Write an enzyme that holds these catalytic residues in place. Structure first.
Site, PDB file in Angstrom:
ATOM      1  N   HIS A 105       0.713  -1.010   0.204  1.00  0.00           N
ATOM      2  CA  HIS A 105       0.251   0.033   0.018  1.00  0.00           C
ATOM      3  C   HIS A 105       0.308   0.859  -0.276  1.00  0.00           C
ATOM      4  O   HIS A 105       0.234   2.272  -0.147  1.00  0.00           O
ATOM      5  CB  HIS A 105      -1.151   0.889   1.064  1.00  0.00           C
ATOM      6  CG  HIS A 105      -0.134   0.324   2.526  1.00  0.00           C
ATOM      7  ND1 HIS A 105      -0.342  -0.470   3.431  1.00  0.00           N
ATOM      8  CD2 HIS A 105      -0.175   1.978   2.742  1.00  0.00           C
ATOM      9  CE1 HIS A 105       0.534  -0.109   4.533  1.00  0.00           C
ATOM     10  NE2 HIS A 105       0.370   1.347   4.103  1.00  0.00           N
TER      11      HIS A 105
ATOM     12  N   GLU B  24      19.628   6.154   7.908  1.00  0.00           N
ATOM     13  CA  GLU B  24      19.227   7.435   8.116  1.00  0.00           C
ATOM     14  C   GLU B  24      19.174   7.148   9.183  1.00  0.00           C
ATOM     15  O   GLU B  24      18.454   6.093   9.850  1.00  0.00           O
ATOM     16  CB  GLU B  24      17.741   7.806   7.080  1.00  0.00           C
ATOM     17  CG  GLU B  24      16.925   8.884   6.708  1.00  0.00           C
ATOM     18  CD  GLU B  24      17.759   9.886   7.125  1.00  0.00           C
ATOM     19  OE1 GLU B  24      18.360  10.277   7.823  1.00  0.00           O
ATOM     20  OE2 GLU B  24      17.617  10.459   5.624  1.00  0.00           O
TER      21      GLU B  24
ATOM     22  N   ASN C 217      18.101  10.994  11.150  1.00  0.00           N
ATOM     23  CA  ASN C 217      17.528  12.058  11.262  1.00  0.00           C
ATOM     24  C   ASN C 217      17.376  12.911   9.913  1.00  0.00           C
ATOM     25  O   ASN C 217      17.674  12.991   9.112  1.00  0.00           O
ATOM     26  CB  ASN C 217      18.499  13.458  11.776  1.00  0.00           C
ATOM     27  CG  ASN C 217      17.505  14.671  12.165  1.00  0.00           C
ATOM     28  OD1 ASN C 217      16.523  15.174  11.886  1.00  0.00           O
ATOM     29  ND2 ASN C 217      17.922  15.564  13.219  1.00  0.00           N
TER      30      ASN C 217
ATOM     31  N   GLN D 283      17.941  16.213   8.692  1.00  0.00           N
ATOM     32  CA  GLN D 283      19.733  16.295   8.689  1.00  0.00           C
ATOM     33  C   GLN D 283      21.009  15.170   7.724  1.00  0.00           C
ATOM     34  O   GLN D 283      19.766  14.632   8.530  1.00  0.00           O
ATOM     35  CB  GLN D 283      20.186  17.539   9.853  1.00  0.00           C
ATOM     36  CG  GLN D 283      19.313  16.967  11.276  1.00  0.00           C
ATOM     37  CD  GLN D 283      20.413  17.527  12.529  1.00  0.00           C
ATOM     38  OE1 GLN D 283      21.339  18.030  12.088  1.00  0.00           O
ATOM     39  NE2 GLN D 283      19.537  18.560  12.963  1.00  0.00           N
TER      40      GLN D 283
ATOM     41  N   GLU E  22      24.455   8.670   5.423  1.00  0.00           N
ATOM     42  CA  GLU E  22      23.034   8.504   4.212  1.00  0.00           C
ATOM     43  C   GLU E  22      23.916   7.746   3.612  1.00  0.00           C
ATOM     44  O   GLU E  22      25.057   8.472   2.805  1.00  0.00           O
ATOM     45  CB  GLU E  22      22.039   9.172   3.866  1.00  0.00           C
ATOM     46  CG  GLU E  22      21.423  10.113   5.761  1.00  0.00           C
ATOM     47  CD  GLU E  22      22.694  10.814   6.404  1.00  0.00           C
ATOM     48  OE1 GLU E  22      23.480  10.499   6.142  1.00  0.00           O
ATOM     49  OE2 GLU E  22      21.399  11.750   6.860  1.00  0.00           O
TER      50      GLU E  22
ATOM     51  N   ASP F  53      -0.693  -7.506   1.816  1.00  0.00           N
ATOM     52  CA  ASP F  53       0.651  -6.126   1.776  1.00  0.00           C
ATOM     53  C   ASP F  53       2.095  -6.002   1.721  1.00  0.00           C
ATOM     54  O   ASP F  53       2.348  -5.853   2.805  1.00  0.00           O
ATOM     55  CB  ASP F  53      -0.342  -5.353   3.184  1.00  0.00           C
ATOM     56  CG  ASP F  53       0.119  -3.921   3.019  1.00  0.00           C
ATOM     57  OD1 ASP F  53       0.182  -3.167   1.833  1.00  0.00           O
ATOM     58  OD2 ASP F  53      -1.030  -2.918   4.448  1.00  0.00           O
TER      59      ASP F  53
ATOM     60  N   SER G   1       4.323   2.869   8.271  1.00  0.00           N
ATOM     61  CA  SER G   1       3.697   1.616   6.650  1.00  0.00           C
ATOM     62  C   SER G   1       5.238   0.944   6.484  1.00  0.00           C
ATOM     63  O   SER G   1       5.788   1.569   6.093  1.00  0.00           O
ATOM     64  CB  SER G   1       2.675   2.107   6.694  1.00  0.00           C
ATOM     65  OG  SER G   1       1.768   1.855   7.068  1.00  0.00           O
TER      66      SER G   1
END
Ligand SMILES: *[C@@H](O)C(CC)(CC)C(=O)Nc1ccc(C)nc1
Ligand code: NA
Length: 240
Positions: A45, A59, A61, A64, A69, A93, A188
């Site tokens: 979904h 990741e 934050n 910033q 990252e 799902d 999700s």
């Protein structure tokens, strides 16, 4: 995540942020789990809409760039062919995203461990939901990755009339339902990490909560049961 705390930075290194392009900016919409250097597991979904998506690994934050990252495009979206967006209660799902590039694995970016096919956890098994989702019903996304303890509620209890009834299927995992801690909008597609023989494995893909609210007593957060889809996952990766 409602009722959680900020995770230790990069302590769930398979957790990704799934984002979509809005004008010239990117917006967090769902979680996911890195399962190969070029594949992410998320909820169907989450990729219902025809948006431009990217994945962010490493990741912590969302507001910033801290240096851990890596930002990568989504090349291919494979939704489970029985997914029906009109009927999340029917299940399926789950979706796999093939990344435009293979990410570099390091301390901050690791593949998530999946359970063996068909694995079922005992009632009240120790698990944690993680994500950047709302920190209260109708609140706002978390800036920093959150975690909360959400112990499983087994199928016989979860599908009983005092919980979710026939809304929940045995292809799902229930966890939480204490009225305090839960998944919420923006979580999700992300992982439920459950402790099995000393190791955390991703047993759930966050799928739904009550229409009444995120943290609702005897409405545990409902996840796609990853162990129901191991063959499907490996088939997709082998043929795409
Ligand atoms: C995911 O962020 C979540 C928030 C209410 C569940 C925790 C969600 O969006 N679930 C969901 C949305 C739409 C459809 C069709 N199914 C499930
Ligand atoms: Na960041």
């Amino acid at each position: 995540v409602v009722g959680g705390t900020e995770a230790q930075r990069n302590s769930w290194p398979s957790q990704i942020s799934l984002q979509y392009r809005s004008g010239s900016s990117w917006a967090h919409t769902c979680g996911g789990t890195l399962i190969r250097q070029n594949w992410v597991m998320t909820a169907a979904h989450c990729v219902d809409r025809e948006l431009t998506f990217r994945v962010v690994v490493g990741e912590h934050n969302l507001n910033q760039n801290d240096g851990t990252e890596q930002y990568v495009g989504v090349q291919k979206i494979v939704v489970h062919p029985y997914w029906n967006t009109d009927d999340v209660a029917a299940g399926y799902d789950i979706a796999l995203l093939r990344l435009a590039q293979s990410v570099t694995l390091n301390s901050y970016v690791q593949l998530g461990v999946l359970p063996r096919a068909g694995t079922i956890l005992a009632n009240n098994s120790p698990c944690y939901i993680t994500g950047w989702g709302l920190t209260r019903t109708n609140g706002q996304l978390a800036q920093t990755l959150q975690q909360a303890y959400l112990p499983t509620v087994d199928y016989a209890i979860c599908s009983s009339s005092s919980y979710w009834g026939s809304t929940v299927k045995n292809s799902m995992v229930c966890a939480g339902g204490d009225g305090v801690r839960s998944g919420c909008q923006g979580d999700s597609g992300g992982p439920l990490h459950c402790l099995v023989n000393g190791q955390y494995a991703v047993h759930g893909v966050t799928s739904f909560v009550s229409r009444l609210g995120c943290n609702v007593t005897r409405k545990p957060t409902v996840f796609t049961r990853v162990s129901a889809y191991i063959s499907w996952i490996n088939n997709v990766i082998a043929s795409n």
